[PDB]
């Protein structure tokens, strides 16, 4: 019956000259930092509900680190348990995001990353394919260094 494919978008978005207008579908490769739900009231248990989620997201061609803002998380309505672990391989729609620059810090070189302010989780689950990071791309690398020089 054929298959419905998603267009790669990461490399083109970064190299493009404008902030994203339309939503972008991607696969969740890995949870680098999961999030905890905000629990009301004082408790000796640690509260980390002011930190977002950090995800590694693939578009079939490249991966990118995504910071899922606390704003995106708290407004969202969750079917299963709050947070992302257990959803590796699922399709993920980034409805509101932006390309940001992270300067070198704590041993890690500068890179482009995404900040996600609104997302939805699609039901589609799929095999996870090893894929180069978008920052390993020569054109991206060149633009990173242009960006840093400002």
From Swiss-Prot:
GO molecular-function term, one example from the UniProt record: telomeric DNA binding
GO cellular component term of the entry, any: nuclear body
Modified residues (Phosphoserine): 22
Localization terms from the record: Nucleus; Chromosome, Telomere
Motif PWI boundaries: 8-10
Source domain of life: Eukaryota
Keywords: Chromosome, Disease variant, DNA-binding, Dyskeratosis congenita, Isopeptide bond, Nucleus, Phosphoprotein, Telomere, Ubl conjugation
Biological processes per GO annotation: embryonic limb morphogenesis; establishment of protein localization to telomere; intracellular protein transport; negative regulation of telomere maintenance via telomerase; positive regulation of telomere maintenance; protection from non-homologous end joining at telomere; protein localization to chromosome, telomeric region; regulation of establishment of protein localization to telomere
Record bears the keyword Coiled coil: no
Function recorded in the entry: Component of the shelterin complex (telosome) that is involved in the regulation of telomere length and protection. Shelterin associates with arrays of double-stranded TTAGGG repeats added by telomerase and protects chromosome ends. Without its protective activity, telomeres are no longer hidden from the DNA damage surveillance and chromosome ends are inappropriately processed by DNA repair pathways. Promotes binding of POT1 to single-stranded telomeric DNA. Modulates the inhibitory effects of POT1 on telomere elongation.
Record: disease: Dyskeratosis congenita, autosomal dominant, 6: A form of dyskeratosis congenita, a rare multisystem disorder caused by defective telomere maintenance. It is characterized by progressive bone marrow failure, and the clinical triad of reticulated skin hyperpigmentation, nail dystrophy, and mucosal leukoplakia. Common but variable features include premature graying, aplastic anemia, low platelets, osteoporosis, pulmonary fibrosis, and liver fibrosis among others. Early mortality is often associated with bone marrow failure, infections, fatal pulmonary complications, or malignancy.
Subunit composition and interactions: Component of the shelterin complex (telosome) composed of TERF1, TERF2, TINF2, TERF2IP ACD and POT1. Forms heterodimers with POT1. Identified in a complex with POT1 and single-stranded telomeric DNA. Interacts with STN1 and TINF2.
The protein's name: Adrenocortical dysplasia protein homolog
Organism: Homo sapiens
Residues included from the entire protein: 4 to 154 of 458
């Amino acid at each position: 019956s054929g298959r419905l494919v998603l267009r790669p978008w990461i490399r083109e978005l970064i190299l493009g000259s404008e902030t994203p207008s339309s939503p972008r579908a991607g696969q969740l490769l890995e949870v680098l930092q999961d999030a905890e739900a905000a629990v009301a009231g004082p408790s000796h248990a640690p509260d980390t509900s002011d930190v977002g989620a950090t995800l590694l997201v693939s578009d079939g061609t490249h991966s990118v680190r995504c910071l899922v803002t606390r704003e995106a998380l708290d407004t969202s309505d969750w079917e299963e348990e709050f947070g992302f672990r257990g959803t590796e391989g699922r399709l993920l729609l980034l409805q509101d995001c932006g390309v940001h620059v992270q300067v070198a810090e704590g041993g890690a070189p500068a890179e482009f990353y995404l900040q996600v302010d609104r997302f939805s989780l699609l039901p589609t689950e799929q095999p996870r394919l090893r894929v180069p990071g978008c920052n390993q791309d020569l054109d991206v690398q060149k633009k990173l260094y242009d960006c840093l020089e400002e």
